[PDB]
Design a protein that fits this description.
This is part of a larger assembly, with eight protein chains of eight kinds. With about 150 residues, chain D is α+β, with helices and mostly antiparallel strands. Chain D has a single domain, classed as 3-Layer(aba) Sandwich (Glutaredoxin), CATH 3.40.30. Chain D contains two helices and four strands; from the N terminus they run βαβββα. In chain D, α1 links the parallel β1 and β2. In chain D, α1 packs parallel to α2. Chain E has about 150 residues and is mainly alpha-helical. Chain E has a single domain, classed as 50s Ribosomal Protein L17, Chain: A (Alpha-Beta Complex). Chain E has five helices and three strands. Chain E has a three-stranded antiparallel beta sheet with strand order 1-3-2. In chain E, α1 packs across α2. The longest helix of chain E is centred in the first third of the chain and has 19 residues. Helices cover about 35% and strands about 25% of the residues of chain G. Chain G contains eight helices and 13 strands. Chain G is an alpha+beta fold and about 300 residues long. Classes of the chains: A alpha+beta (about 130), B little secondary structure (about 50), C mainly alpha (about 290), D alpha+beta (about 150), E mainly alpha (about 150), F alpha+beta (about 110), G alpha+beta (about 300), H alpha+beta (about 170). The structure holds zinc ion (ZN). Zinc ion binds next to α2 of chain F.
């Protein structure tokens, strides 16, 4: 019988802030490493065709606000913030259903200490923080 | 709807015959030794015939 | 209470039966049970197989050495002299030797004259199976020689049972003709081969090598194995039929779940055909000349 | 009921009919009473027909105990270790004779459901059927929709 | 639906809840250490924080005086609050009322907590110590830290 | 509404013997580093808490003896002392409560 | 020194080890009693009446409770760390040391010695038979460094190669297979002459035994075994080989200029079951353990 | 009333021949007439059923049920008597083989329903039976693998005969 455990159970009083600091720095460095997609090795950029569809994104609902138009009408709007949105993986047309290609996109960054190990390995290979 | 438990038992012997009786318990043995036989300290060394 | 005795007796018998079922006693010898007369049992034994045994020879065949040692140990530990018959009990050692030897030679002659194209090794292994511990013990227990046997360890260890069985065979050999005892060993040992395959008594290891050397002896070049049939190869339940061809001529075939086991079965079939021990062979002729 | 009772296959004891037939009945033990109305058929059976039965088949050992009993009995013991006990309580002499002849006729195998009243050890002579019997072969063993 | 609803329903109404919390807080001020069911102790801890803040607001403050007068029902702990408890936490800002979980109440198996004002001349509670820095994992992490410092 | 039929022992066993109704095994239990009396993680040790509570009860009884009656609550800090253990220079204005004991080797 | 197959070498080594163990068990004629006191903190005053050179501190823990058996990693026989399966000799006082004690340095050293011994056992039996693989020694590196090490000399034909990531993972897989089977770390204290006669082949092991028996006036060197592997080590070891939960080999490095031949240093990091770290922290430790550690002076 | 669990410790075995398995010790203990429901006791017994003595005591110490402390007490007396009477050297070397609850003798009381109508209340009692075997707990049976599933399916396919014919 193996008891459960969390990330900071056996860590010491001095080692807890060190681990937090180091992991946060590694996270921020990984996030900053992806700031220049067009210089690493971008995939070819195709022109837009009539019957084409592009990728969306994951946002965060901030709140609602008033807004006014030039004719004096009032419309309520919702603010959606893009916190850390990255393309995670791409499956070919024939590898999912043969109907359309798929792009997986991730949301805001979360902690690495509370994720599945397979997900952790995936994000380690991708070189990015885990997404909610 | 009116019934309880029973069998109140005690598991210790006592001295009830001397409380009131005209007959006594007939004994066959005594309590200890009238006088302990002290053995010689060097009995093992003197385990021979005689000295 | 209810007045009566019949239901109470019936329930007592039922309870006794249930107690016996729940706690069965260890089994005991038939000689230790009420209805037993040893001389009558010996005579009925001799009469039931339609043979004329010498009575004293049968008693000698049913005595055993370990029994004699136990009896003399008992007498020497009780301090009682019984040297009148113990020194003459004359155990069944020599009778067992004669019976085993004659049974071996008779079974060998029978099987040799029945399957001429058999190897000496195959015939010897067939004889070893037929005189083997399990077969002779089963025959002896079903012919009720385990009851007349005299020995300790009421289980009558299989070695002792087989020794006493062949002692009975030797006693029949001494009392009557070799032809009579040959008919006896036929009837009660050759019949044990019925419904059994050759490679269930021989227990060979390399059928392909055996077939190759047999064809080398018979001046047959070489068997090449070819896939004659198959149904399903990419599934978990395949069927393969492999045929062995000698000089472009098919000599045997065999099925299997894999090609290797199909080839091994084909080799076994070829060996059976070559040795003349097939399911279609002439059944043993039980008769009199 | 078959689903509520055991079962077995048709079989012999030691291949009885292959070589010599042997009597499977080994012993008959009779408990009969000197006095007692229930042992009268057994009494007259012992008087008349037990001697002739013993002379008729000498491979069977017959014991008669003659003890006080309310229920006379016959115990049949067979070469394969089977033991069968029967009540001859208040039975006629003809009934007892039929019973003992039936006991001598049966083998020691259990009288239960017999399951397919034939036992062949070589059911096939020309070869058991398999899905490839009665199926023709193709050139080079080519399965349907093949190329070479 | 109780989305964003603090202040659990404790007694037989809001006034009963306030009076239960007041009794618990008065006991805490008197005894410096109080054991009670876990949820009531949680609410009373939230209240004790602001009680100490009001005590730090000053003895002569009329609003703080009225708040203390309401929240202490024995009238002899108000001087304690203003001249013992508040001056004890002059330097610290909000770090008092340590709260721990004690096994369970015997009768009804209720979840039980203990709460204490820090300072507390009473004997110390068996606090849960963190793992020592000399353990194998902590030594490995310390070596990693030293190597990182050297690489810097 | 009444049951139309009696529930069988098989149905009852299936209902009352399935894993949702069984007691779960807990893996929060380890030995207390002090006193080794099998505490539970995230919960204080019962043995150590009882020890502390007994000492606190004795101290509070001494407090009540010293204070006199109700409604006292001295306006100074407090300090507990033991056999020997002369008062220190920093605890002058504090109330002193010394019952009679050797200071336990967990209260410093 | 003569020609010997490695398999037969292991069989003869095991036979000599077992013969020595049998004579050590036999020179004591009868069962003698020792009053081993418990000077620990949780169960004070407990005295065990144990058997001389038969019973172990694990047996004392069995008397106490199951938690003692599970958590106790080392013993303290009146001053000194004893491995859990070393028979007791004299009437002593005992104290059990775990991984989470206030001063776990002794158990850390013992655990790292055990991990190095397992790594050496995995290494010795994972190379081609026609190469000569020889174990030099396991340096007593401190736990504060990144990994435990084992020095190995390979045959001359392998003075130019380097193992890749797949081979490293194969070494880790062999280590985990060794972990999966519960193998006690059997101990033995022998004389110098017997110690030489068990090995008799490797001059590195011979000089190791000389160095370990010189400073002892009684000329006695410790000997430990898991399964059928026997190594010479300084200091006691952990009771079971399944105590380790996370185990890896990181890399191997060379130190050539100190000898005409080549000596390689295999490095690895492990974490016990009581002190398992998260995936990310273990990745950090794995990344650090690949660095060369030089602590021999 | 039957008291047969009590007499299972009075069985005396003949001395073993030198070359024989250890024959681990076997201790039976029980508590009669517990003021508890037998189903409620069955749940705790079922939890305790397969564990070792120390693990069972640990699990029972942090269960907030009335019968948990009763079973803990019974296990403690069983362990003490196993070490003292039945020659078990290691007090921790015991595991639970049998752990079950049984109905005890009960009483009947009147319930006074809300009219001139009523019900009969039963004052429930129960027994607890435990049996300890000396030695480590037996390993749990691992779940059967797909290999075993395929093997048994193949054996089922191979066992079939041609039915209702020769
Ligand atoms: Zn504690």
């Amino acid at each position: 019988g193996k008891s459960g455990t969390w990330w900071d159970e056996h860590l010491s009083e001095e080692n807890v802030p060190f681990i937090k600091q180091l992991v946060s720095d590694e996270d921020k460095a990984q996030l900053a490493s992806k700031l220049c997609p067009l210089k690493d090795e971008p995939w070819p950029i195709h022109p837009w065709e009539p019957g084409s569809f592009r990728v969306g994104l994951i946002a965060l609902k901030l709140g609602m606000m008033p807004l006014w138009t030039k004719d004096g009408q009032k419309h309520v709007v919702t603010l959606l913030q893009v916190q850390d949105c990255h393309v995670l993986k791409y499956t070919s047309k024939e590898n999912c259903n043969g109907k359309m290609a798929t792009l997986s996109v991730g949301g805001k960054t979360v902690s690495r200490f509370r994720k599945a190990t397979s997900i952790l390995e995936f994000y380690r290979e991708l070189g990015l923080p885990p997404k909610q | 709807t009116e019934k309880e438990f029973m069998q109140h038992a005690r598991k210790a012997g006592l001295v009830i015959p001397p409380e009131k009786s005209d007959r006594s318990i007939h004994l066959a043995c005594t309590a200890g030794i009238f006088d302990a036989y002290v053995p010689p300290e060097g009995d093992a060394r003197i385990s021979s015939l005689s000295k | 209470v209810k007045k009566g005795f019949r239901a109470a007796f019936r329930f007592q018998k039922e309870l006794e039966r249930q107690r016996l079922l729940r706690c069965p006693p260890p089994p005991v010898r038939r000689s230790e049970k009420p209805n037993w007369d040893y001389h009558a049992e010996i005579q009925a034994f001799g009469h039931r197989l339609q043979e004329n045994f010498s009575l004293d020879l049968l008693k000698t065949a049913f005595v055993n050495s370990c029994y004699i040692k136990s009896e003399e140990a008992k007498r020497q530990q009780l301090g009682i002299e019984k040297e009148a018959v113990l020194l003459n009990l004359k155990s069944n050692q020599e009778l067992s030797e004669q019976g085993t030897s004659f049974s071996q030679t008779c079974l060998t002659q029978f099987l040799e004259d029945e399957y001429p194209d058999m190897p000496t090794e195959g015939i010897k292994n067939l004889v070893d199976f037929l005189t083997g511990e399990e077969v002779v013990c089963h025959v002896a227990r079903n012919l009720a020689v385990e009851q007349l046997t005299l020995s300790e360890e009421f289980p009558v260890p299989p070695a002792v049972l087989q020794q006493t069985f062949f002692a009975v065979i030797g006693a029949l050999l001494q009392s009557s003709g070799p032809e009579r005892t040959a008919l006896f060993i036929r009837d009660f040992l050759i019949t044990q081969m019925t419904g059994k395959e050759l490679f269930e008594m021989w227990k060979i290891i390399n059928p392909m090598g055996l077939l190759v050397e047999e064809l080398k002896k018979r001046n047959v070049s070489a068997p090449e194995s070819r896939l004659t049939r198959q149904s399903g190869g990419t599934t978990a339940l395949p069927l393969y039929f492999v045929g062995l061809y000698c000089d472009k001529k098919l000599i045997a075939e065999g099925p299997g779940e894999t090609v290797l086991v199909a080839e091994e079965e084909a080799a076994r079939v070829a060996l059976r055909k070559l040795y003349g021990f097939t399911e279609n062979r002439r059944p043993w002729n039980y008769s009199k000349p | 009921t078959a689903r509520g009772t055991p079962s077995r296959f048709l079989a012999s004891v030691l291949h009885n009919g292959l070589g010599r037939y042997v009597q499977q009945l080994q012993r008959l033990s009779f408990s009969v009473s000197r006095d007692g109305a229930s042992s009268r058929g057994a009494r007259e059976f012992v008087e008349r027909e037990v001697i002739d039965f013993a002379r008729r088949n000498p491979g069977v050992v017959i014991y008669v105990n003659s003890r006080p009993c309310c229920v006379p009995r016959v115990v049949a013991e067979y070469l394969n270790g089977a033991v069968r006990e029967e009540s001859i309580h208040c039975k006629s002499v003809e009934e007892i004779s039929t019973l003992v002849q039936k006991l001598a006729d049966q083998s020691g195998l259990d009288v239960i459901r017999i399951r397919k009243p034939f036992h062949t050890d070589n059911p096939s002579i020309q070869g058991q059927w398999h899905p490839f019997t009665n199926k023709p072969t193709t050139f080079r063993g080519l399965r349907p929709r093949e190329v070479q | 639906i109780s989305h964003g609803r603090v202040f659990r329903r404790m007694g037989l109404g809001p006034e009963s809840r306030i009076h239960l919390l007041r009794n618990l807080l008065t006991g805490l001020v008197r005894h410096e250490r109080i054991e009670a069911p876990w949820a009531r102790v949680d609410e009373m801890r939230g209240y004790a924080e602001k009680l100490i803040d009001y005590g730090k607001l000053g003895d002569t403050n009329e609003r703080a005086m009225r708040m203390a007068d309401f929240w202490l029902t024995e009238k002899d702990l108000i001087p304690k609050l203003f001249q013992v408890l508040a001056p004890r936490y002059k330097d610290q800002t909000g770090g008092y009322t340590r709260m721990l979980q004690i096994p369970n109440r015997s009768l009804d198996r209720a979840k039980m907590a203990v709460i204490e004002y820090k300072g507390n001349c009473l004997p110390p509670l068996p606090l849960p110590r963190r793992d020592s820095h000399l353990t194998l994992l902590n030594q490995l992490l310390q070596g990693l830290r030293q190597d990182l410092r050297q690489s810097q | 509404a009444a049951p139309k039929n009696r529930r069988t022992i098989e149905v009852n066993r299936c209902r009352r013997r399935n894993p949702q109704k069984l007691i779960k095994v807990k893996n929060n239990i380890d030995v207390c580093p002090e006193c080794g009396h099998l505490k539970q993680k995230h919960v204080l040790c019962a043995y150590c808490y009882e020890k502390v509570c007994k000492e606190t009860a004795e101290i509070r009884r001494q407090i009540g003896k010293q204070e006199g009656g109700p409604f006292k609550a001295p306006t100074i800090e407090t300090v507990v002392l033991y056999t020997g253990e002369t008062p220190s220079e920093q605890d002058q204005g504090k109330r002193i409560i010394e019952r009679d004991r050797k200071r336990p080797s967990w209260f410093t | 020194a003569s020609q010997l197959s490695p398999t037969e070498l292991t069989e003869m080594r095991n036979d000599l080890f077992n013969k020595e163990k049998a004579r050590q068990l036999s020179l004591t004629p009868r069962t003698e009693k020792i009053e081993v006191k418990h000077v620990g903190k949780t169960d004070p005053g407990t005295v065990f009446v144990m058997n001389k050179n038969i019973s172990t501190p694990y047996s004392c823990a069995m008397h106490l409770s199951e938690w003692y058996c599970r958590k106790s990693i080392l013993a303290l026989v009146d001053g000194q760390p004893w491995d859990m399966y070393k028979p007791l000799t004299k009437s002593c006082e005992i104290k059990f040391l775990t991984f989470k004690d206030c001063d776990p340095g002794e158990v850390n050293k013992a655990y790292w010695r055990s991990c190095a011994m397992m790594m050496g056992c995995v290494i010795e039996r994972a190379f081609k038979d026609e190469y000569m693989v020889n174990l030099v020694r396991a340096p007593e590196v401190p736990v504060i460094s990144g990994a435990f090490c084992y020095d190995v000399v390979l045959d001359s034909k392998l003075d130019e190669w380097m193992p890749t990531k797949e081979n490293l993972r194969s070494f880790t897989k062999d280590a985990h297979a060794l972990i999966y089977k519960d193998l006690p770390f059997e101990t033995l204290e022998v004389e110098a002459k017997v110690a030489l006669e068990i090995f008799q082949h490797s001059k590195y092991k011979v000089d190791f035994i000389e160095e370990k028996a010189s400073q002892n006036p009684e000329r006695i060197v410790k000997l430990h075994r898991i399964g059928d592997f026997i190594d010479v080590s300084e200091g006691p070891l952990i009771p079971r080989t399944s105590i380790c939960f996370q185990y890896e080999v990181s890399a191997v490095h060379n130190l050539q200029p100190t000898q005409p031949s080549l000596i390689r240093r295999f490095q690895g990091v492990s974490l016990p079951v009581h002190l398992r770290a998260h995936f990310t922290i273990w990745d950090k430790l794995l990344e650090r353990s690949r660095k060369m550690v030089t602590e021999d002076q | 009333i039957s008291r047969k669990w009590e007499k299972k410790n009075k069985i005396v075995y003949p001395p073993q021949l030198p070359g024989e398995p250890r024959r681990p010790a076997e201790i039976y203990h029980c508590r009669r007439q517990i003021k508890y429901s037998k189903d409620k006791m069955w749940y705790l017994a079922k939890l305790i059923r397969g564990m070792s003595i120390d693990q069972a005591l640990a699990q029972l110490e942090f269960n907030d049920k009335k019968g948990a402390k009763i079973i803990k007490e019974v296990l403690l007396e069983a362990q003490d008597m196993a070490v003292r009477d039945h020659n078990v050297e290691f007090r921790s070397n015991l595991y639970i083989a049998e752990s079950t609850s049984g109905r005890g003798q009960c009483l009947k009381r009147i319930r006074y329903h809300g009219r001139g109508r009523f019900g009969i209340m039963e004052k429930v009692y129960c027994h607890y039976f435990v049996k300890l075997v000396e030695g480590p707990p037996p390993p749990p049976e691992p779940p059967k693998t797909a290999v075993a599933h395929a093997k048994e399916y193949i054996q089922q396919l191979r066992s079939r005969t041609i039915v209702h014919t020769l």
